Design an enzyme around this catalytic site. Sequence first.
Site, PDB file in Angstrom:
ATOM      1  N   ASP A 110       0.840  -1.200   0.000  1.00  0.00           N
ATOM      2  CA  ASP A 110       0.000   0.000   0.000  1.00  0.00           C
ATOM      3  C   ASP A 110       0.865   1.234   0.000  1.00  0.00           C
ATOM      4  OD1 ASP A 110      -2.257   1.581  -0.079  1.00  0.00           O
ATOM      5  OD2 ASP A 110      -3.120   0.690   1.758  1.00  0.00           O
ATOM      6  N   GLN A 128      -1.416   7.783  -5.800  1.00  0.00           N
ATOM      7  CA  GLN A 128      -1.481   8.307  -4.452  1.00  0.00           C
ATOM      8  C   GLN A 128      -0.153   8.801  -3.920  1.00  0.00           C
ATOM      9  OE1 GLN A 128      -4.101   8.587  -1.607  1.00  0.00           O
ATOM     10  NE2 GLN A 128      -4.673   9.347  -3.643  1.00  0.00           N
ATOM     11  N   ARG A 155      -3.007   2.078  -6.213  1.00  0.00           N
ATOM     12  CA  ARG A 155      -2.473   0.984  -7.006  1.00  0.00           C
ATOM     13  C   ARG A 155      -3.311   0.762  -8.281  1.00  0.00           C
ATOM     14  NH1 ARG A 155      -1.771  -2.929  -1.808  1.00  0.00           N
ATOM     15  NH2 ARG A 155      -3.422  -1.528  -0.995  1.00  0.00           N
ATOM     16  N   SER A 156      -4.629   0.753  -8.117  1.00  0.00           N
ATOM     17  CA  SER A 156      -5.548   0.624  -9.227  1.00  0.00           C
ATOM     18  C   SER A 156      -5.312   1.732 -10.245  1.00  0.00           C
ATOM     19  CB  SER A 156      -6.983   0.669  -8.730  1.00  0.00           C
ATOM     20  OG  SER A 156      -7.264  -0.318  -7.750  1.00  0.00           O
ATOM     21  N   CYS A 194      -7.952  -2.232  -5.252  1.00  0.00           N
ATOM     22  CA  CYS A 194      -6.889  -2.396  -4.260  1.00  0.00           C
ATOM     23  C   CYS A 194      -7.633  -2.269  -2.950  1.00  0.00           C
ATOM     24  CB  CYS A 194      -5.758  -1.375  -4.472  1.00  0.00           C
ATOM     25  SG  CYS A 194      -6.255   0.313  -4.955  1.00  0.00           S
TER      26      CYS A 194
END
Length: 285
Positions: free
Chosen positions: A185, A266, A225-226, A219
């Site tokens: 993450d 992110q 991540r997506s 995710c």
Amino acid sequence: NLYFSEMEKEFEQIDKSGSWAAIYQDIRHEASDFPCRVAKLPKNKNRNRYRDVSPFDHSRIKLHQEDNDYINASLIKMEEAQRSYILTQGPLPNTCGHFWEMVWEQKSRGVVMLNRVMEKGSLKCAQYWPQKEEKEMIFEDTNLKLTLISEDIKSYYTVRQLELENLTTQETREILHFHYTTWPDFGVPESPASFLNFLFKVRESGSLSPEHGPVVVHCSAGIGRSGTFCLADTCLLLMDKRKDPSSVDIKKVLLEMRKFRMGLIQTADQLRFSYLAVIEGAKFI
Ligand SMILES: [Cl-]
Ligand SMILES: [Cl-]
Ligand SMILES: [Mg+2]
Ligand SMILES: [Mg+2]
């Protein structure tokens, strides 16, 4: 300015100057803002994993549900690339039925999971698919049945075959589950090479084809991540389609994508990785 691709030059110039975090801040500041009213309704409180991550009303996926049509999921439709994705949060214990309801209704062929159920002791996602062939799952609320058929476990990812049955109609479909297990993450994949193997496997399966509904990508929050996954995929698609491969403006593609769901990519390092994956991936297109 240096003259010796356009994409590669940008990267080196960014990497030398160390302005990833700055460019990433530009993207953040420049990103679209649209309402998420349905998401913030009190009655949908328990359908959201994170209260600061919501689908925009305009691009949210609606369940064909008699009762409540809300799921924390967005349709990302990339017009020029001619590719669509559904980006969604890791399902919650009470939203697993909804999740598979969505897969069914949207005629998706693939699910792409980019997280683990547990990461650093923290629950990121419900166990929404059966880990064992012999213990199938029934979702009584949405009237679906789900059975693990087989699985192929590799070092950095696993691919499963699932059988999803609409108990009302008794129709069954094969859904492919692509599970990248080594993407932490707020982090990046173990290497661009492993990421691209994964991506190319998803592609080779036909799951991303217009013959099927949009692939469901998740995710935990369905943004970091997506976002990285989809952005890399779309950029590589555009490079193949365009007469000018070097015309592909990754920052601009990301902003276009951010019109459909907030917060995609992110961290600045995810941004860096996405550029890296596209450059390395371009060889194979
Ligand atoms: Cl596009
Ligand atoms: Cl959970
Ligand atoms: Mg619209
Ligand atoms: Mg067994």
